Amino acid sequence: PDSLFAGLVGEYYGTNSQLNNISDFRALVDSKEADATFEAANISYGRGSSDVAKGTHLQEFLGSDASTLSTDPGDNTDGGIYLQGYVYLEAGTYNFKVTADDGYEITINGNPVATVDNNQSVYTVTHASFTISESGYQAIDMIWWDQGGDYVFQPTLSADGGSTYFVLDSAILSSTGETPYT
Ligand SMILES: CO[C@H]1O[C@H](CO)[C@@H](O)[C@H](O)[C@H]1O
Ligand SMILES: [Ca+2]
Ligand SMILES: [Ca+2]
Ligand SMILES: [Ca+2]
Ligand SMILES: [Ca+2]
Ligand SMILES: [Ca+2]
Ligand SMILES: [Ca+2]
Ligand SMILES: [Ca+2]
Ligand SMILES: [Ca+2]
Secondary structure (H helix, E strand, C coil): CCCCCCCEEEEEEEECCCCCCHHHHHHHHHHCCCCEEEEECECCEEEECCCCCCCCHHHHHHHHHHHHCCCCCCCCCEEEEEEEEEEEECCEEEEEEEEEECCEEEEECCEEEEEECCCCCCEEEECCCEEECCCEEEEEEEEEEECCCCEEEEEEEECCCCCCCEECECCCEECCCCCCCC
């Protein structure tokens, strides 16, 4: 049975190879078991320095979510996270605005809705709008990585045409698509 919690299922992967793009990180995820798992209940991570994959930097980056880590990974040069689960959204129009170092991809109901397919120092992109056709728990997944140096990841979402944005957190996240009461 899968744990029901108000968050996404988190997996962390580290590597001593260079992560240059989304393909490289997804290949890392498919290559092995997660180096750690966690509950992603407050998806606003970092900012920090001196490589996410070194020392306790992952714990610092994950902050409020670090207390759910399954283990303390050893050192790597490069690393990233894969989050998957569900997000409660009412039918309507939305767009992401993401602050990140390095890149990332977010999908909703299997369709990319926010993509940065390269390394970058901290940058904020306002992404194109997408529609939700039916109110309820939408499938969501995210990948983010750090090739080294600084690291930050804060996807925010707007329901009102970019006037206000919110962090994805325990108010609307579900690990399985059932209603969490945690
Ligand atoms: C040179 O380092 C800078 O740029 C790279 C991307 O090239 C980022 O990954 C890193 O965090 C940032 O500090
Ligand atoms: Ca895997
Ligand atoms: Ca460590
Ligand atoms: Ca924090
Ligand atoms: Ca905590
Ligand atoms: Ca730069
Ligand atoms: Ca690297
Ligand atoms: Ca970096
Ligand atoms: Ca505003």
